[PDB]
Structures are given as C-alpha cells and as structure tokens.
Write an enzyme that holds these catalytic residues in place. Structure first.
Site, mmCIF file in Angstrom:
data_model
loop_
_atom_site.group_PDB
_atom_site.id
_atom_site.type_symbol
_atom_site.label_atom_id
_atom_site.label_comp_id
_atom_site.label_asym_id
_atom_site.label_seq_id
_atom_site.Cartn_x
_atom_site.Cartn_y
_atom_site.Cartn_z
ATOM 1 N N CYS A 1 0.853 -1.205 0.000
ATOM 2 C CA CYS A 1 0.000 0.000 0.000
ATOM 3 C C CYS A 1 0.894 1.262 0.000
ATOM 4 O O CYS A 1 2.080 1.157 0.299
ATOM 5 C CB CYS A 1 -0.916 -0.081 1.239
ATOM 6 S SG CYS A 1 -2.091 1.271 1.564
ATOM 7 N N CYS B 1 -4.120 0.043 -2.479
ATOM 8 C CA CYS B 1 -4.649 1.360 -2.111
ATOM 9 C C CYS B 1 -4.697 2.288 -3.342
ATOM 10 O O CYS B 1 -4.322 3.459 -3.272
ATOM 11 C CB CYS B 1 -3.779 1.886 -0.954
ATOM 12 S SG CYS B 1 -3.771 0.803 0.509
#
Length: 131
Positions: A8, A80
């Site tokens: 992420c 993400c």
C-alpha cells in the site's frame, strides 16, 4: 510458480490483508511477500483479524519495498490504488495491479470482514489469472 509483492502507499497502521490470504490460498502455487514503503509495521489489529481465518502474519513486514529487487517478482499488488510512493521498477513488473480497495484502519470489525470478502475474491482472481 512465481513471486508476488503485496503493498500500500504507506504501511504504518494499515491492515492490507491480501498478502495473508494469497499465501493461505496459494502457497503451493506462488510465493508471497509484503513490505513497507517507508520504515513501518502493519496494523497490530491485523494479526488478530486475519487469525479469525487462521492466517499467520505476526511479523510479516520487516523491511521497506526499496530494500528488495523488483524483478524477482512477476506480480506487484498495490492495495490502495496506485503504488506511487515506491521506485519505478515495482510498477514495471508484468502483473503490476492497482486494486482500488479500502483499508480496515479507523473502522469496525464488520469492515475487516467486508474487506476479507472483497480481498478473497480479488486474490482468487489474481491466482486464477497467474496460474
């Protein structure tokens, strides 16, 4: 068989999950690693919430992505949206995927269970296209 990095934009107080499912679902098929993008650790909450599924991740993030080599990994999963806070060699791997998912941080156990459901289907699809 091939190697996969799961990441992420930042890892401190983020749960991510997909790395723990990918090795729990496919370790006879693929190798899985997870890393920070800066000096960090996954959510302390993530261990207990992935252990509802029996998943082993107690100390999985030890080093940043930039400590590794990207071409060892055929796949890089950014959980993400875009990877962006990482070197260009990680976005140029053959199966670099941007998953536009949420993270369980700052929200309920029903959101951890929601993210596990969505992530399970994403990880099963990933494995079923790289098999």
């Amino acid at each position: 068989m091939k190697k996969v990095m799961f990441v992420c934009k930042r890892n401190s107080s983020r749960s991510q999950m997909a790395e723990g499912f990918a090795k729990t679902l496919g370790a006879g098929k693929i190798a899985v690693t997870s890393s920070g993008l800066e000096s960090s650790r996954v959510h302390p909450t993530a261990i207990a919430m992935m252990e509802e599924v029996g998943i082993d991740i107690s100390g999985q993030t030890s080093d940043p992505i930039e400590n590794f080599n990207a071409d060892d990994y055929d796949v890089v999963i950014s959980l993400c949206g875009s990877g962006v806070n990482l070197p260009p060699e990680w976005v140029t791997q053959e199966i670099f995927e941007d998953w536009q998912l949420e993270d369980p941080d700052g929200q309920s156990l029903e959101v951890f269970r929601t993210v596990r459901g969505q992530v399970k289907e994403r990880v099963e699809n990933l494995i079923a296209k790289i098999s």
